[PDB]
Amino acid sequence: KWDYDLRCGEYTLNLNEKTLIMGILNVTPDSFSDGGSYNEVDAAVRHAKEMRDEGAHIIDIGKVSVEEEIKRVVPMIQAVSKEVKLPISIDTYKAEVAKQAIEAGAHIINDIWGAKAEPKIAEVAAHYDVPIILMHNRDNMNYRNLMADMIADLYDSIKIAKDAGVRDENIILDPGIGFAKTPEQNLEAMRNLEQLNVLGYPVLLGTSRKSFIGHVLDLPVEERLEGTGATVCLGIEKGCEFVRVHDVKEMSRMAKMMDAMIGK
Amino acid sequence: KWDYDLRCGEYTLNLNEKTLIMGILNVTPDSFSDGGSYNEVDAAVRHAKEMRDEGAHIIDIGKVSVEEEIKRVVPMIQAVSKEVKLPISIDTYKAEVAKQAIEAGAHIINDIWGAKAEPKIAEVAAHYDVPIILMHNRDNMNYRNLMADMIADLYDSIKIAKDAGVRDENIILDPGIGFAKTPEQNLEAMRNLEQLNVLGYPVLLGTSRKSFIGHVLDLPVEERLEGTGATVCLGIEKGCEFVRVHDVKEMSRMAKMMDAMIGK
Ligand SMILES: Nc1nc2c(c(=O)[nH]1)N=C(CCNc1ccc(C(=O)O)cc1)CN2
Ligand SMILES: Nc1nc2c(c(=O)[nH]1)N=C(CCNc1ccc(C(=O)O)cc1)CN2
User: Fold this and answer.
1) CB A60 within 8 A of CB A24
2) Cα torsion through A19, A216, B86, B65, rounded to 10
3) Number of neighbouring beta carbons within 10 Å of residue A210
4) Quick check: helix, strand or coil at residue B242?
5) Nearest residue, CB atoms, A261 vs list B190, B253, B258
6) Which of A18, A133, B11, B81 fits a 20 to 30 Å CA distance from B97?
7) Minimal-distance CA residue of chain A relative to B188
8) Ligand 2 pocket: which of B73, B244, B245, B246 to mutate (most atoms <8 Å of CB)?
9) Residue closest to B176 by CA, chosen among B216, B140, B203, B195
10) Which candidate from B227, B257, B263 shows the least CB-CB separation from A253?
């Protein structure tokens, strides 16, 4: 179906073969420090290595100053990238930040403002020639038509991407769950993911432990595994490529089961 | 969508409102007895009551002699029916058995040979006027066309049903996972559940902990929760009505999440 791979440095991800799990590195902050404390990182490396072991195929590393985020995250990318043999994605909207990460050893860029926040980002994706993820997100929540608007808004991201010079191969789409959407907006979007596909790019769907699960099911964050299940399952028969989850053990076994049913 | 309810004795189930969970009562046998030992039953009642508490809306009670099955199960139906305020379904292919159960207080009849095993069953459904579940199942596994054959075979069940005099309202369909199917047959059937719907009757899908999950994922029975997840999720967006599971807590939260996504 996809005839192209996610060439990304020393690694490459194959879209046809299986659903590709992105593991959320939870960036618990050693407050007494801004930078690479031993606990801070070890703890992070401990937790990636784990996820390596859980079936996860990429690691995600999430008003605050740039400088910090750079001292925060540049010594962290650098341990894991050097310790864990998998591609590593940065979770920033900042271009000054984007650079440093990829400079550290970061692989795929994950943006929650989809080149809108700081256009300069896209240029940097161009430059180090690396996949970027664009997310739907906005600063009000007035939609004539949820989807039609999403798909619009997504499109004015791709514009900047493609204008700055990102190859189509290096572009990924994220519907951006829990951003700028009431929890009924979130549902509808889940109901109608599949129209993200007309647009001809991989979709990554991020729903682990999200507050709409708790709106429906009425159960809080540490009891949201099952919710996350369904969103990932429906997520997938609707043809999405990556899912970005916390619970790697459990979702990884849900991916593979759907992957065998829909015959992926 | 359905304009009719599952009138079933003192109870009634509404098909539009939510996915309807059937809970597997696991009939651990006090071997030193054939009949209603105190442990035997208490243990059963302990476990239904639990499932009452887990979100489950019907209780399922599964070469061996009739007489036994009757002494086995007639004092058990009778506790739970009298202790747990929900509809209760019998898991037999025998008509002599069918009677006794419903006589005890049983509600909905679950058959794994779909009126084929002992046609007389269907007559009894007629007679006590109660829903019956028909399952696809056979005694070889040669199919020209999986589906087309399933759907055929299902149809020659409905024939007996409808001939003996079962109203269409009281008929339910089960694709019969892990019966007469290689684990690739099972997958394909899951892939193409939705064609069970042309036939115009509720579908109940039974996959909890089934061996095809373990063929795919390669994990045995007590590690099969996630598998069961996906089968139930995909199960449902494909428009099935009941799922018959062991893990009521967990699947019940997967039902409700899909139920909110597909807008059911
Ligand atoms: N590409 C991508 N990046 C992300 C995402 C996401 O879904 N996709 N979510 C993230 C979670 C942070 N924001 C939220 C956290 C929770 C919720 C909610 O519970 O609804 C909504 C938003 C962070 N970064
Ligand atoms: N209506 C209905 N009745 C049932 C079912 C079922 O799926 N639907 N399964 C049952 C499980 C018993 N048989 C099997 C048990 C395990 C497996 C397997 O692991 O593949 C296959 C079959 C018993 N009764």
Assistant:
1) yes
2) 10
3) 18
4) strand
5) B190
6) B11
7) A261
8) B244
9) B203
10) B227
